Amino acid sequence: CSYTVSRPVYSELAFQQQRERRLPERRTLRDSLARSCSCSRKRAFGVVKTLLPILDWLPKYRVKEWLLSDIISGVSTGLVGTLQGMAYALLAAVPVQFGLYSAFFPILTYFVFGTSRHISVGPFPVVSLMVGSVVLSMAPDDHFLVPSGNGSALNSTTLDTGTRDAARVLLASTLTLLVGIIQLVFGGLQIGFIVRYLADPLVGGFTTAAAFQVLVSQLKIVLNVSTKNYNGILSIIYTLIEIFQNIGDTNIADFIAGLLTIIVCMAVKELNDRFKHRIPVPIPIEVIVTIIATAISYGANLEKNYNAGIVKSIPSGFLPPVLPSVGLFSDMLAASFSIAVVAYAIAVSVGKVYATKHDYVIDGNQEFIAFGISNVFSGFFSCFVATTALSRTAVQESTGGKTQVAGLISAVIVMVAIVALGRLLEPLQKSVLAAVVIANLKGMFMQVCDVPRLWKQNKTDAVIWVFTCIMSIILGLDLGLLAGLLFALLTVVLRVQFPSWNGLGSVPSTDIYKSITHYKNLEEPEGVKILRFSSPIFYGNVDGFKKCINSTVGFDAIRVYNKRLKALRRIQKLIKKGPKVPIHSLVLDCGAVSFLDVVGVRSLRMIVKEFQRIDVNVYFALLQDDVLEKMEQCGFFDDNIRKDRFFLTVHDAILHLQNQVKSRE
Amino acid sequence: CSYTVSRPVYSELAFQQQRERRLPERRTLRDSLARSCSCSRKRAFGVVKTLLPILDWLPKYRVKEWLLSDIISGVSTGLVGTLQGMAYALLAAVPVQFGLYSAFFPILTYFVFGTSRHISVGPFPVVSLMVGSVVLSMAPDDHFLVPSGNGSALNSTTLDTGTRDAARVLLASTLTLLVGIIQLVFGGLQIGFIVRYLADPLVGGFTTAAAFQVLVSQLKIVLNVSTKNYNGILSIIYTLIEIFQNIGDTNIADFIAGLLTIIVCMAVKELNDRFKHRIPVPIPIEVIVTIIATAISYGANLEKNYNAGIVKSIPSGFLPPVLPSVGLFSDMLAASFSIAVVAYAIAVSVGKVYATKHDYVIDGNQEFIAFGISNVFSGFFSCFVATTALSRTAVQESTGGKTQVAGLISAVIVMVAIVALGRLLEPLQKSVLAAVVIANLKGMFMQVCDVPRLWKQNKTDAVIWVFTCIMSIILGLDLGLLAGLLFALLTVVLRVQFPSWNGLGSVPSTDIYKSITHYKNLEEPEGVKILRFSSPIFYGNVDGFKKCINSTVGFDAIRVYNKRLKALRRIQKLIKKGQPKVPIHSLVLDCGAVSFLDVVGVRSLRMIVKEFQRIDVNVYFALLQDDVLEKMEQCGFFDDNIRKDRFFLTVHDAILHLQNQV
C-alpha cells in the first residue's frame, strides 16, 4: 500500500522524556557463577551425551541394510585409506608402516568421541608435508651420518639408514602429541573463534600453495634424486632449481612408470567423475593400479636389473606403545599450532560439506575435542597428525556411508594389512605411491581458476588470495599462514579506515536520502550540506573524517577561523587609526557507526567546537543508542553541547533546520 | 511539528525503475596523469610552503611571552642536552667528543625544516645502544693490538689507540648518513599514514614506561652503579634488579647530594604552579641549581677529595667536515633499516603525547623528511642520529616553552660552551643535571591517572593503555610499540567482529525503531521480528551473524530442517505400513550499519536466505544504501528466484510490506 507517518520532531531529548528505559539485569557475579554452575541430573546427562556422542547414534541403528552398506563402504574406505596412508608416509619421513598406523588408531579414537558420520579420519597430503618439513628442520639428514665403510679418501660418512628412522618417528610422535594438546586446549577452553579468521580465499590460496609444494616434493621422490632438504625461506624455489640442476641423476624406468601411472590414474579419475551417469560406484583406480604395479614389479627383478626404488622395509607387525620425548615443545610450538589450525580448518570444511550434503549437524568444539583426543592417542603409538582427505572421504560417501561403523570396519582392513598381509607390497615401487598423491592434487590445482572470478567480485578478496598463495611460497609454508592471517586482518582494518563517504541528498518530496554521486535529479537543502560516514570513526580514520568534512564543505574550519582572526585584528587597528558563504549547517549522517573509540570522540568534540566559532552548526542524524550511551560516558555532553544537536532520523534534522530558518531569520 | 511524508512503499527495483543513475568516471591514468600540478603556480607555491615549515610560525610569533620564556627554557634543555651528549657518546663505544655536535647541528637544520614544538632533537638512550651494537659487531675491539710495552711475561698487547676511535667515529658517521638517506627516501613515496595508527592510549601507554625507562637509566648514574648493558626482552627488569643487587658501591656523598636536589627542585616547581599569578615569569630553577652545584664543587673538590663524580672531560673546538666511506654503506644497510623505523617511532611518539594538551596535531609526511634531512645534515660532520630524548622534551615543555626557538637558543648555549665556556661547567657533579630530568618527569608520571578515567569512559582503550605499558616494560621500548600497535589494530577487528546486536522494535503509533533490550512498553509485530547486527558481515563474523539469528529467533534453521525431514520420512513409512516451530512468519534483517562485504559474506548471506526458504519462513532486508547493494549483485547474489524486491529502503517499509501481504 502506502507509507505515511506524522509525529513531532523527536531529535534526542524529546524521545528520552516519555520513554521508560529498561534497567540492566543485576550482574551479581557470585550468584551468577553459582547459578551457572549446573548440578541437576539433566545437565549432567546432557554434557555426557555431548562429550561422548557415541551413545547417541548407536542405540538408534538401522542394522537391516545399514550393516551391508557399512561393510561394503568399510572395505572400500579401508583399501583407499591404507593406500593413501602408505603413500603419504613418504611425506612424513617415516617408513611405510606408520602411515597404516596413523590410518588405524585415529579411527578407533574418533569412533568413541567423534560427532561426524562420513568423515574418514586419516592422513592428509598438506599435513604430512608440514610434518615432514618440520621434521627436516628439527632433524636434518646431515646430522645422522656415521663415518663407517672405509671410504676412498676421507671417512665413509654414508647415509644413516636405520636409527635415523627411529629419531624421525619419535619427533613425529612428539609433534602429534603437541598438536593434540593444542587442539584439546582450544576445544576445552571454548576458544574456537580463532579459526574464524581463516577466510575462504585465504584457505584456498594456502591449499593451492600447499598442493604446489606437494607436487614438487612428489616429483622429487618420483625422479629418485637426492636434494639437501632445503627448509626455511625460498625452500620450494631452491629445491625446484636443485631438481632442474640434478636431472642427470634420475631413473629412466622410474620416471617412465611414474608418468604412465600418472596419465592412467588421471584419465580414469576424469572418466569416472564425468561419466557418473553410467557407473554408480567409483572405480578404485588406485587399488587396481597398485595391484598391477606390485604384480609387474615382482615378475622381473626391478630392484637389481632396473635399479628402481622400492620400500622393502616392512616389519609386518605391531609395537608396544612408547612414551613421547618431552622437551621439544618450545622449539615446535608455532609449527604445532599451524598444523593444528590447518588440520581443523580442513576437517571443518569437509564436515560441513558432507553434512549439508546429507543434512545433519556437526559441532565445532566437539570436532576439536575429538581430533585432540585422536592425536593424543596417536602420539602414544608413533603416528602423525590425522585429518580427513577430500578424496578419501569422497569414496566413503559415494559407496554409501551412514555411520562411523564403516570407518570402524575401514580400520579392520588396515588391521589385516598390518598384522599379516602387507609384506606382499615389498617390491612395490615408491614412484607409484608418490604418483597417486599427484593425481589427487587435481582438486586443489583447479582452485587457481577462481582468481578471474574473484577479481570481477570484491577485489580485496582476490588480493588476499594472491597474497596468501604467493607469500606461502616465498617464506616457507608454516610461516606463510601467519603472514596471511595478519594480512587479512590488515585488509579488514583498511576497509574500516577508508570508508565510502558521499554527498547524501533528498529525492523531491520524499523522506529517504540517497547519494548524490549516483543520481542526477536530486535536490539538496539550501545551505545545509549532508554527509554520511560509514566505517565508525576510530583512532586511525579520524583524520580521514577531518579530510572528508573539509572536502564536503569546501573549506577548513581551521583556516577560515584563522583568516577571520587575521581580519579581526585589521579591524581593531583601523578604528584606532581614526569562505563560509554557502554552508549554513552540517548534518552528519553517522548511522553506520558501531564503536566510537573515545580517542575519536575527543576529535569529534573538537570539530563541533571549531565549527561553532565559524558559526556553522554540525548536527548528527542517525546515531545509535549504544553509541550515545558511550559518548555520554566519554565526556561529550558539556554545558554547551546538549542533546538538541543530535537527531533520530536524517529527515528530522533537515526539518528542524528548515523550521528554525523559517522561525528565525 | 508533524510532517506529511506520504509516499508509496519503495523497494530496490521499485525505486530504480523511475529514477536514473550517473555514469561513473573511470578516471584512467593514461590521460589524467598530468592533473596534479601541470602549470598552475598556486599548487607549486603550496608544496614549497609545506616543505619549509619555517614561514608559518616564525613570522607569526608574539614576543609578549616569547623572549624571556624560551631563553630560560633553552638553557634548561641545553644543559640536559650537554649531559646526554657526554653520556650517550660513551655508551656508543665512540670517544665522548661529538655529543655536543649531535645537539648543535641537527637543531639548526630542524629549526627551519620541521613543525613540531616541544621536541629537542638529539641522541636517545635506547637508540644509542643500537648504534653501539652494530658498531661493535662490524668493527673488532682490537684493530692492531700492538704487542709492545715490555710486559711481565709475554709482549704487552696494548690496545691500539688513535686509529681505533677514528675508525669508530667514521663508522658511526657513515651509519648516521645511511639512516638519514633512508629516512628521506621514506618521505619520497609519502608514506605518512602510519602516524594515524598511533592512538592516544598507544602513545600514552608508550611514554609512561619510557618515562620509567629513563628513570632507571638516570637512577644508575645518580647512584654511580656500574651495571651491564641489557637490551631486547626483560631489559628494564634486568637493569632494575642489577641496581638493587649492586647498591653497595654507591657514593654516599653523591647520593645525599642528588636526593637533596631532587627535593628542592620539585618543591619550587609546584610552588611556581601555586604562585603562578603572583610571579609572571616562571623562575628558571634549572640554571639556579646548576650554578650553585658548580660553586660548592669547585670550592670543595668533590672529585679528588670526595669521589662524587664530575664531567672533567669537556672538549673544545669544532672539527672540519669529513667525507664518509661509501664502500661501507652496503653492510650497514641490513641493520640500519630496523634502527631507522624505531627512530621515527620514538620521534613522533613524543610528539603525539603533547598533542593531547595543546591543539598542535602534526602530520607524518612532513616530520619524516624533517628528521630525515636533519640526519643527512648531521652527516658529513661526525654527529649522531636525529632522534629526540624523552627527558629533554619534558624539561622543555614543563618549564615554559612556546615554539621551537627554545631549541635554537639551546644550541647557542652549547655553542658557547664548546668554544668559550668549557672550563665553566667542569666540576658539575653530574647529579643536579641528571636529577632535574626527574622533576620535569612528573608531567608523564602523572599520566597514569587516566587509567581510572579511561576505564569509566571505554573499557577497550583502557586495556590498550595498560597493555602497551606492561609490554614495553618486558619487551623493551623497541618491541613495546610494535606489540602495542598490533594489539591496537587487534582491538579494532575484535570490536567489529563482536558487535552489540539487539532486536529492534517500533514505538506505538510511530515509525521509530529502537532496541527492545534498552526500553519498555514497546510492541513487536505478530510473526515479524527485526534484527540489527550493526557490523559488516566479513569472513570473521560469518558464524557470529548466524549465531545472532538463531539466538534471536529462538530456534535454529538447521536443526528444524533435519527434524522436519526425519518426521516426514517417519510419517511416510507409516503410510505404506498403515495409519517446536515458532509462529514467526518472517524476519527482517536491519543490516543498515554495514559498511563493506566480502565473498564469504555474500555467500553465507545467500545460504541464510536459502536455508530459511526451505522452512517456509521468509527473510527480508533493510537499507543497503549505495555500496553494499551494488557489491552483492556483482558477486552473483541474484541468480533465479532471489531478487531485489526482498530489499527495502526504510525499516518501516518492510513492516508495512509484511502487514498488507497477510
Ligand SMILES: [Cl-]
Ligand atoms: Cl587428498
